[PDB]
Amino acid sequence: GPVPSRARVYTDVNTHRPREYWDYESHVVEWGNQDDYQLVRKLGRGKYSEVFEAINITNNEKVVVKILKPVKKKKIKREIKILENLRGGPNIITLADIVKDPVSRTPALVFEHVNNTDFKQLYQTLTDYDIRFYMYEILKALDYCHSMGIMHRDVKPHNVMIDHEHRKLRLIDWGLAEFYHPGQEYNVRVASRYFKGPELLVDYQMYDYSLDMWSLGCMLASMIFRKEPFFHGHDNYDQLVRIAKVLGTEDLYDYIDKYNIELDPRFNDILGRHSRKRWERFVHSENQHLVSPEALDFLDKLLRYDHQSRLTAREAMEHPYFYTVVKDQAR
Ligand SMILES: Cc1cnc2c(S(=O)(=O)N3CCC(CCNCc4ccc(-c5ccccc5)c(Cl)c4)CC3)cccc2c1
C-alpha cells in the first residue's frame, strides 16, 4: 500500500481550529430574504449555475447572484462554509448573502459586485508584465486559502476573473474546494483534465495544497507558450502521456517508486519511455516575447511529479519571475 504524505506547509492549521471551522456538515445555513434582491441581467451560465447581475433593493447596492443548479446538500454546505471562512481574503470573491430562489427552490449565493473583462479582447494584448502581475495576484489568493486550510482543486482560466481596467482579479468557483487534513484520502476525480496533477492521474489520494500549484503551472505554460490547454489529453490516460512526453518517464517512475504507488501494468506499457525535454523546444517566434529564463525556472519548479518538491504559494511569490512586480507594487 502507498507511503503516506503530508503538506510541507500549513499542515495542522485545521487541527488548531474549532471543529465547526471545517466540519461543514454541522453548519446551519440562515437564509436571507429573497425579496431583497432583484435580478437585472444574465451574465453567464454554467452546467452547475446561472450568474446574474442584481440589485439589493434595501440599499441600492449592485450585487452578483449565482443561482446553483441542484447539487448534493453536502457539497453546497462545503462551498458555503469555505466561502464564509475565506471572506475578506485577497482576491477571493466576497459572499454577502445566501437566499433561496423562488422558481427553482435552489440556493442563490449573493456576492459583492465584481467585473469581468471579456478575456478575448485582453488575450491578444497581454504583455509579459501583465502575466507576471496577474499570476502574482492569483498566488496571493492561493497562499491565503492554503493558509486557511483550504485547497481550491479547480484552478483554471475559467475560474479566474480579471477586471483589467482596475487591475483587479478574483479566484472563483469554490465548488470543488476542500479542507486539508493530514492523513485524509481525497477523491482524485477533481479538477479539469488539463490541470489535473500527476497525483490524481496515478490515483494517489493523500494529496494536499500542492495540487493547486501544478494546476497553476499548467496555466502559466499555456500563457507563455500561447497553447491552451498546454497538456491537451483527450482522456485521463492520454493526459498523463502528454505530461510524460515532456517531463519524461524516468521521473514519473521515480515518483511512483518513492510513494509505493500501485499502477496498472497496462498503464506502464502505454506510458512507454520518453526523455525529459528542454522547455526551449516549445518557444517559437509567436510566444518568445512571453518567455524568459526566470519564467522557465519558475515553471520548472511548479511542474514536478513529486507534489512535495513543488514550490509553495509563498515560495512562488519570492521567485525572481515576480521581482519587478513586487518592487513596482511597493511603488
Ligand atoms: C462569482 C461570479 C461568477 N461568474 C461571473 C461571471 S461569468 O460566469 O459570466 N464568468 C465566469 C468567469 C469567466 C472567467 C474568464 N477568465 C479569463 C482569464 C483570466 C485570467 C487569466 C490569466 C491568468 C494568469 C495570467 C494571465 C491571465 C486567464 Cl488565462 C484567463 C468569465 C465569465 C461574470 C461576471 C461576474 C461573475 C461572478
Curated annotation (Swiss-Prot):
This is Casein kinase II subunit alpha. One of its GO terms (cellular component) is Sin3-type complex. Keywords: Apoptosis, ATP-binding, Biological rhythms, Cell cycle, Disease variant, Intellectual disability, Kinase, Nucleotide-binding, Nucleus, Phosphoprotein, Serine/threonine-protein kinase, Transcription, Transcription regulation, Transferase, Wnt signaling pathway. It comes from Homo sapiens (Human). Constitutively active protein kinase whose activity is not directly affected by phosphorylation. Seems to be regulated by level of expression and localization. Can use both ATP and GTP as phosphoryl donors. Phosphorylation by casein kinase 2 has been estimated to represent up to one quarter of the eukaryotic phosphoproteome. Casein kinase 2 has been found to be increased at protein level and up-regulated at the level of enzyme activity in the majority of cancers. However, elevated levels of casein kinase 2 are present in certain normal organs such as brain and testes. It comes from the Eukaryota. Its EC number is 2.7.11.1. Residues 34-39 are annotated as: Interaction with beta subunit. Heterotetramer composed of two catalytic subunits (alpha chain and/or alpha' chain) and two regulatory subunits (beta chains). The tetramer can exist as a combination of 2 alpha/2 beta, 2 alpha'/2 beta or 1 alpha/1 alpha'/2 beta subunits. Also part of a CK2-SPT16-SSRP1 complex composed of SSRP1, SUPT16H, CSNK2A1, CSNK2A2 and CSNK2B, which forms following UV irradiation. Interacts with RNPS1. Interacts with SNAI1. Interacts with PML (isoform PML-12). Interacts with CCAR2. Interacts with HIRIP3. Catalytic subunit of a constitutively active serine/threonine-protein kinase complex that phosphorylates a large number of substrates containing acidic residues C-terminal to the phosphorylated serine or threonine. Regulates numerous cellular processes, such as cell cycle progression, apoptosis and transcription, as well as viral infection. May act as a regulatory node which integrates and coordinates numerous signals leading to an appropriate cellular response. Phosphorylation does not directly affect casein kinase 2 activity, but may contribute to its regulation by forming binding sites for interacting proteins and/or targeting it to different compartments. GO terms for molecular function: ATP binding; Hsp90 protein binding; identical protein binding; kinase activity; protein serine kinase activity; protein serine/threonine kinase activity. GO terms for biological process: apoptotic process; chaperone-mediated protein folding; DNA damage response; double-strand break repair; negative regulation of apoptotic signaling pathway; negative regulation of double-strand break repair via homologous recombination; negative regulation of proteasomal ubiquitin-dependent protein catabolic process; negative regulation of signal transduction by p53 class mediator. ATP binds at residues 43-51, 66. Belongs to the protein kinase superfamily. Ser/Thr protein kinase family. CK2 subfamily. The active site is at 154 (proton acceptor). Expressed in gastric carcinoma tissue and the expression gradually increases with the progression of the carcinoma (at protein level). The lineage of its organism: Eukaryota, Metazoa, Chordata, Craniata, Vertebrata. Its main location: nucleus. It catalyses: L-seryl-[protein] + ATP = O-phospho-L-seryl-[protein] + ADP + H(+); L-threonyl-[protein] + ATP = O-phospho-L-threonyl-[protein] + ADP + H(+).
